[PDB]
Amino acid sequence: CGTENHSAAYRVDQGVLNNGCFVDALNVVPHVFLLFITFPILFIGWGSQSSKVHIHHSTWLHFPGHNLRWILTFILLFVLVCEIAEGILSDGVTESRHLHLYMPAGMAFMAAITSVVYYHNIETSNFPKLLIALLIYWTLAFITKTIKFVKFYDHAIGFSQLRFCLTGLLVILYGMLLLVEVNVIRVRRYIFFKTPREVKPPEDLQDLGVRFLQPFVNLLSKGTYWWMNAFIKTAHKKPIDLRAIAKLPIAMRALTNYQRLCVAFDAQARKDTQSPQGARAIWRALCHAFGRRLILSSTFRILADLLGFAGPLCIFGIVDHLGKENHVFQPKTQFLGVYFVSSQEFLGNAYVLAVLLFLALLLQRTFLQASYYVAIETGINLRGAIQTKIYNKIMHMSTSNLSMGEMTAGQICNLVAIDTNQLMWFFFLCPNLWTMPVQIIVGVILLYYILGVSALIGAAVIILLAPVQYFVATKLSQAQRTTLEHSNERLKQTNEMLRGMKLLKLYAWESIFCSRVEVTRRKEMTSLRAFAVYTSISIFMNTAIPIAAVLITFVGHVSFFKESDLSPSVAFASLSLFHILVTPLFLLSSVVRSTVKALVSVQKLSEFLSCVQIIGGFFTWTPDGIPTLSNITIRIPR
Amino acid sequence: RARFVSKKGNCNVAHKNIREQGRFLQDVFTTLVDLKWPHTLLIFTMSFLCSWLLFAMVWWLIAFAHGDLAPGEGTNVPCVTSIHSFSSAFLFSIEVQVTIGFGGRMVTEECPLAILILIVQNIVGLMINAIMLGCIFMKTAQAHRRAETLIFSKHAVITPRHGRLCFMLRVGDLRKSMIISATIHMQVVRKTTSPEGEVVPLHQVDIPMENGVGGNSIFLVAPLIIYHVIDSNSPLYDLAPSDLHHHQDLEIIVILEGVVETTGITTQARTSYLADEILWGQRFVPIVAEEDGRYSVDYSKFGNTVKVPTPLCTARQLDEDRSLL
Amino acid sequence: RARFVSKKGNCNVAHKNIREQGRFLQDVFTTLVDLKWPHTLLIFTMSFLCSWLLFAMVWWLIAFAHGDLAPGEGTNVPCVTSIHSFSSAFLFSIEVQVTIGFGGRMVTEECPLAILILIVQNIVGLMINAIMLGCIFMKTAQAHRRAETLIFSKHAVITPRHGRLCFMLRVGDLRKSMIISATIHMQVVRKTTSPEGEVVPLHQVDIPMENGVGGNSIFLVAPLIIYHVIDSNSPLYDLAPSDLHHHQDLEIIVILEGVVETTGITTQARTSYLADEILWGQRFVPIVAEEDGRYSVDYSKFGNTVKVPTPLCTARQLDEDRSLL
Amino acid sequence: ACTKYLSSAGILLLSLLVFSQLLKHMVLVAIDYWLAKWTDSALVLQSVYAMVFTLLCSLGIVLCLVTSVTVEWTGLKVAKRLHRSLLNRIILAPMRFFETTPLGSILNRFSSDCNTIDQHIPSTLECLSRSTLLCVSALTVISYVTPVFLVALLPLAVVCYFIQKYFRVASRDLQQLDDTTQLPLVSHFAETVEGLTTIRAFRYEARFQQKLLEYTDSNNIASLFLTAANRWLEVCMEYIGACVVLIAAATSISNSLHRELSAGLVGLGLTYALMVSNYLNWMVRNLADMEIQ
Ligand SMILES: Nc1ncnc2c1ncn2[C@@H]1O[C@H](COP(=O)(O)OP(=O)(O)OP(=O)(O)O)[C@@H](O)[C@H]1O
Ligand SMILES: Nc1ncnc2c1ncn2[C@@H]1O[C@H](COP(=O)(O)OP(=O)(O)OP(=O)(O)O)[C@@H](O)[C@H]1O
């Protein structure tokens, strides 16, 4: 902290000189204490689980404020990156390197990372002794925040200070941190010397898992790290893999089996309304049935649109502070003794903020595949629940046996399967459709902050690329209908060739080789030209990506010619915007035909939603008409 | 194919449905004693260093709180002399903990805060140095290693002695040091079904040592054979020679206990012999050979067995044949 | 409602009419070892400080008796240098006891009294530092904690096996570490009256382990059931199923003993099952399940029992019904 | 294990057509580097503006037609060659050894191989060639944009080698079991439609209800395996590709300040870093579709 005479200056003034370098040194001791206590407990649990441990099979426990503990562990990461970022600028000033200026931020990252290992060691073994050592830290860290604020008020800037912004963010964590420490299930106090919660130790999930070969429990780190290391270890083993890849159903423990049932039961509850059954009624009951995960996974998809959309903005800053700033060479103009909030888009902050764009890109792909995951689980519970009430409904009803007298009920079974999985596949990316126009509008808006004519070029390119996509794909779908009919004729000649194997040698060889090869070349010729139309639409799709390429060239060319300026911005950045557009274009038209198939599938679902004494008994083939049998009377003794 | 315990020992079992891991965490000493040497050294080296840094930060703080280190005022006397750098405080902290007493850094009577702190530094650093002495000693007394020198044969044998069918197992010692009051317990672990319809997965039934007195143990200097007389209470009474080795998939465990003549600790050596690990018809070759000075025992013959003419009938049939005779 | 021992252990008893407390006071080590960690640290911290002050007062006295500290005479050499304040003597005293050897306070050859005192300070302060090492070690070896991992079931069962009525209790282990030569003793504590008119409040009569050999203990890795065959010597021979659970207010204690494979110390785990804690008609569900690698044991089934068809008669009546048959 | 597939529907014309598609994509990355170098020319401030913006649109329609030319009419020669050569290669066989064989595997593998391979082979094939061509194309392009010290390709293909190996194994197993799980459900659906009066005869209709729930339960668990596959696929591939983006940021750092930074191609490693992770994503899943297909 000393360059020439700073230590002496600090020493002269009373009260640690209003904490010049002392406010920073004060923060460090608690972090060291929190890290020096930890190694003994962390290391031991690292060794006892490596040589001889029995808790290597099934162990899990929950604590009140789990989601607020992770959210505070993630937000303290963003605040630790930020403190250091500001810290780097102060160090550079290029006069003297003050070591005690950026140290409090580097201690914290290790400490907060050590706090996450304490939560994992506590989630394994339930004891309040750890929450008391953390509380001892949260309180000492709370008191150090006050000094910085206290020091700062006298030395007030307002909003022009970057040290303050970091401190302010940090202060909220301490406030948030108290609730975690206020758990009622902790028996470390003198009061309530017994266990306040006796039903907490036994978990429903563990019991699911204890008899489970593969637990597959959602109540985990939520990082998709253990869901892959359990399957993965077996896959890595060579002897294990052969066994695993064969008896996988047996290997599967059918864990979510206790949760599939709830969804079937939940569907019935949703249906239970005051109004009669309706296509709309079953639709909005189904949306009411899913409950949290629809708008929840949609909200995670919108957060993925938030992190994903910006992606390019960080990149421009590099071309400006690096490329355009050719001979700037001026680090600061404010009070150089401290950090200031202005010019936060520095050159180094463009680097670490670009790595922050990589970390937020992991947040965007992670939350993207997370909402994808909850969508797939939602469709799994969807087809399971609607399958349950479906076959329970037709198994219980036994109504209108006249249409059941025909084979149309079997068509209702096959179309119930293809339309049911077509309906879950219709629901498969519904938050992606909900979050597609927000990404198109926001990306088109940032494209409008770039220029106008490029937005006209690319937006017109997608605006023409969508009707060729779903219309040409609809032509390929009719090609799949007629080609499916001719391929069904190939199946009829194929089982007719099985009849040729049932027939003689010479007669079936000549007449079935000639007739089956000629008719199979006929229907395979019509489906060959249909295959040429379908591959032509696939080439239409192939051509479509150069439509975007053409727009990029016409965008930079015409948008260059209408204006009177040149920049390396819109090439790299606006090319990036174009990449974003492709996923939402064909996914948008695919979501449109998915919506048409969704309304058709819900329409077909609503269409499906419709010893002995005998005295004077009347029987019918059809209740709409007069009984077929009248006044039938007989009794049979046992 | 399914096994219970290895031919060397330490049978591994899988546990499901644990209630609390907190009790295990609370019970620190046993785990510490159990852990291997590389980690053990790591625990004591880091915990010491982790402490040395804590006593150094608060010492760099008492000089920063007084502030006498950078201005260099001649009238203002420092609470500790020669503290010029940040590192020096850490060096001083090491000094007090290990009682090196270098002499360069001297403590004065100016600050009544650091002197009470110095006492807290010394008592806790004297306490962990003492706690470490008792933990390392406990590992210096582990007697698993003594138990290894206790060797068991490759296979087992079953031949009739004195007119009665017996099961033979041989054990030996490779040391000049002995084991006191070492009792041996053999159990037959098979899955039995009761007449009421209950299936116990692994039932453990004990078999007699056949000592006339009512034996528990025997003085072991040279390789001795243990014999299991098949009577009406023995489960192997209804077993045939060529039919029992493949048809049945059971195991018999050997439990050798005892204490060391050097250390009070009592150790245990275990092994198991399968249906294919047992031989019928042969016997254990005589290891003891008498020389001019003493009796010598060759261990290459320990895993050698010779076949002799024995009956191909079961013990129920053998006692039945002798009760009819 | 009246209990003898808890479902966890450590049965509390009230003692009246004590003869002397002096013997207990005299026996210091056991009490010290027994006391919890917070007080234990307090005893060693205060006793050290209490000593450090005694060695400091007599050192502030040898400088006060010589008087060389305040006049500052250059020809008169002090028995110990740099003694300016009262606190300094205490600091010097700490130095000698912990052998810090700072170097600021030096001792001379002027006063033949303080040098012999310095020897008395060092030998007693070296003695309590050594005595503390042996007391802390003794607490590092307490094996009550190892005994906790030894779990007993929630309730007990009584069903006939092989045609004879038996009482079943199951015990398990949560560790990878074992217990050697661990003998189990079960006692029935009921208040019996003799034919002469004497009422003993709590009579302890032992029940057989039913091991064929004459068993004391069994190798415990997985949860095993202990069985109590009701014969003519068993007190439960004259008991009916629905009448014995409420009419009688007695208890049966479980005494599990044994030694640790890590430490020589032998521990004991105890529990008791009341008249309402015993179940008639059901049995213990099979915990052991065979997998590809090893045999797994689920502990959620440990406290689960299933009911099967059993006779509603007493053992005297059951043997009477079979002796008439 | 593609030497059998290399002889399918010809070798020479497919090798020249897909070779011309690879050359057309090399012309596409030539349009990329020409737009990047002319972007450096605009950053140095037209001079060659007619040459730049006119010459930079040559391989657009050429890449669109030539890149889709290898599978343009390949379904015709694969249709008559595979269908006629297969139906003739099984038609000229004697009827005794074909008569002593189960017809379900022959007609199932035969007809499902013809419709499935003839319908779905060229889409994932051309998507696989486009994905791998773009992946190695921008991979070596942004790799040369980095200095030789800033390549660091050995950890990338190390962790990527781990991912493609063990995800190839477990993904083949997961698509195998989840692919095989579907048919018995529809089998007892046909049995459910057939024995409806037997369900009236079976006085305990809940037996097929709970067994039914076990079947759809097993397919639901298999669906959770599918989401596990896409989960670790997307998260692992985008995670390691994000590490490649951070290494790209290190390359832009050293190439930016450590020496004379170029007038362009600074953000080319960044856009090609995010799209490099996209290339690892569609390259991994395209490797999966090429594995099953
Ligand atoms: N109040 C007490 N509490 C515990 N132990 C006692 C008490 N009083 C005596 N004892 C001890 O218990 C033993 C029981 O015998 P008894 O109570 O008859 O003692 P005693 O014959 O009175 O002889 P003494 O005077 O030594 O107790 C005695 O030998 C004595 O040592
Ligand atoms: N998951 C577990 N793993 C190991 N031990 C357990 C577990 N659950 C309970 N125990 C202990 O084992 C004993 C077995 O009895 P049981 O399993 O019936 O417990 P319980 O009747 O549910 O009472 P508790 O709620 O205390 O477990 C219990 O007394 C308990 O202390």
Author numbering:
A (entry chain B): 6 to 615, 678 to 705
B (entry chain A), C (entry chain C): 32 to 356
D (entry chain B): 1000 to 1044, 1061 to 1308
Would you copy out the relevant sentences from the publication that reported this structure?
The structure shows that the KATP channel is an octamer built around a Kir6.2 tetramer with each subunit complexed to one SUR1. The complex is ~200 Å in width in the longest dimension and ~125 Å in height, and is shaped like a propeller with the Kir6.2 pore and TMD0 forming a compact central core and the SUR1-ABC core structure forming the blades. In our structure, TMD0-L0 sits in between the SUR1 and Kir6.2 subunits and is the primary point of contact between the SUR1-ABC core and Kir6.2. A comparison of closed (Kir3.2 apostate) and open (Kir3.2-R201A + PIP2) G-loop structures in relation to Kir6.2 suggests that this gate is also closed. Together, these observations indicate a closed channel structure, which is expected since the sample contained saturating concentrations of inhibitory ATP and GBC. An overview of the ATP binding site from the side, and from the top, with ATP colored in red, illustrates that the pocket is at the interface of adjacent Kir6.2 N and C domains. A close-up view shows that the docked ATP is surrounded by residues I182, L205, Y330, F333, and G334 from the same subunit, and R50 from the adjacent subunit. In our structure, we see that the density corresponding to ATP is located on the periphery of the Kir6.2 cytoplasmic domain, and traversed by the N-terminal segment of L0 of SUR1 immediately following TMD0, with the Cα of K205 coming within only ~10 Å of the site. Overall, the SUR1-ABC core is in an inward-facing conformation, with the NBDs clearly separated. However, in contrast to other ABC exporters of known structure whereby transporter halves are related by either a true or a pseudo two-fold symmetry axis, depending on whether the two halves are identical or not, we find a clear rotation and a translation of TMD1-NBD1 relative to TMD2-NDB2, such that TMD1-NBD1 is ~15° off the symmetry axis and is translated by ~10 Å horizontally (relative to the membrane).
